[PDB]
Write a protein that binds this ligand. Structure first.
Ligand SMILES: CCN(c1ccc(C(C)C)c(OCCOC)c1)c1ccc(C(=O)O)cn1
Ligand SMILES: CCN(c1ccc(C(C)C)c(OCCOC)c1)c1ccc(C(=O)O)cn1
Lengths: 10, 218, 218, 10
């Protein structure tokens, strides 16, 4: 879940 | 100021935050989606946020994004009298918001946030600190270590108070006045979320991918 | 302390606020109706409230009653670990609240309010001052002179800060910690109101006359 | 409107 948010926090 | 320097919180504001009249609601939602990307970059610049577990970073941003974005566009809008300034370079006039069916929440933004920020000349350091307090919300459900987030919130508001006492010593109530806009910010954030869920339900208003992801459960 | 003495705010708390297990929701609503009467008596004892125009007294109490009552029963409930203490002498256990369909809001009350009041040992003077800040809400719509209500709020929080600095000088962040429970109180008040409007709509839960009057428009 | 509240504030 929360695919975009996780990618941007990387 | 030592472990949570206001200079770094100001730098975070200045790094992410640099008009023509704008369905205005579609434009407003487009600007919200754009600013969710910017919000992640802002949060990474707030001291110690990036050191939290990834799952907790996600929890804090999902819990706070709407209040964080509302605080930003409200403070941006001090520069006009009858409108909101979107991050896309568009102005939404009171009359335009009312004619699109979102007059009541527009009015709350101007009366409880923009006008009060203007009246007290809230500065960007104070804005950034209030946003960092909202970000470090220790009541966010599911956090791995709520006490660590509590501690970070405490460091922000201690730094904010010291900043206010140094820069505005003639205004002893200023620190409390800042904190006492947070209940209004909470209410207005909840109402904005209610509108967004309705827009999603009716299906007549484009909602872009990141804004849509923030409207997912839980 | 001069125009808004904390001693008088404490006296207001002590004048109005002196168990067996409790549909628990009917008992909870009965206690809310009972405490609306008590709330009017409390507000009359807060300095300068009774000097406002009658229409403004009505506006402030209609805007704040739910947060005011939640703060009171939350602080009352510090004395138990797994329940809320109603003003009627009844305890509502976590298990009872969950089994009646209101578990989520019960949990928010205990986690965001009761446990945090307990953790910091919030005292009755501090409770009363927070309630007086909520009462003197200058954002309440329709007030004849919002700036006068703003001024009264400012007198309360100035008195509260001086009280905290004198009684808890070893805790420099205590005043901010108190104020920073008000966003949670606002959220939980809004959620309680949502439940009450649903109970009224479905019609299966007795709602007594004063509570019903508070659920009238606007 | 607000009949009970007005009476009690008297
Ligand atoms: C909180 C997310 N949100 C946002 C999203 C949806 C709405 C609807 C209720 C219309 C909104 O309503 C504001 C009052 O409209 C009358 C604001 C925005 C919008 C723009 C920006 C920006 O441009 O910085 C940031 N967040
Ligand atoms: C705010 C008014 N309200 C009150 C009214 C309705 C509810 C429903 C959501 C159940 C409530 O839910 C609290 C959490 O229940 C799980 C609290 C009360 C109730 C009792 C007292 C008192 O006894 O002092 C004061 N206010």
């Amino acid at each position: 879940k929360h695919k975009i948010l996780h990618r941007l926090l990387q | 100021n030592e472990d949570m320097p206001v200079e770094r919180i100001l730098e975070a504001e200045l790094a992410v935050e640099p008009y023509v009249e704008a369905d205005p609601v579609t434009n407003i939602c487009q600007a919200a989606d754009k600013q969710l990307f910017t919000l992640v970059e802002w949060a990474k610049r707030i001291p110690h946020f990036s050191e939290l577990p990834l799952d907790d970073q996600v929890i804090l941003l999902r819990a706070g994004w709407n209040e964080l974005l509302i605080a930003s566009f409200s403070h941006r809008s001090i520069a006009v009298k009858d409108g909101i300034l979107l991050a896309t370079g568009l102005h939404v006039h009171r009359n335009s918001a009312h004619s699109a069916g979102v007059g009541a929440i527009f009015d709350r933004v101007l009366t409880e946030l923009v006008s009060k920020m203007r009246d007290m000349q809230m500065d960007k350091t104070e804005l950034g600190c209030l946003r960092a307090i909202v970000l470090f919300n220790p009541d966010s459900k599911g956090l791995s270590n709520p006490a660590e987030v509590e501690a970070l919130r405490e460091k922000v508001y201690a730094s904010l108070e010291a900043y206010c006492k140094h820069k505005y010593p003639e205004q002893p109530g200023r620190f409390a006045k800042l904190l006492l806009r947070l209940p209004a910010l909470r209410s207005i954030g909840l109402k904005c979320l209610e509108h967004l869920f309705f827009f999603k339900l009716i299906g007549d208003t484009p909602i872009d991918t990141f804004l849509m992801e923030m409207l997912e459960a839980p």
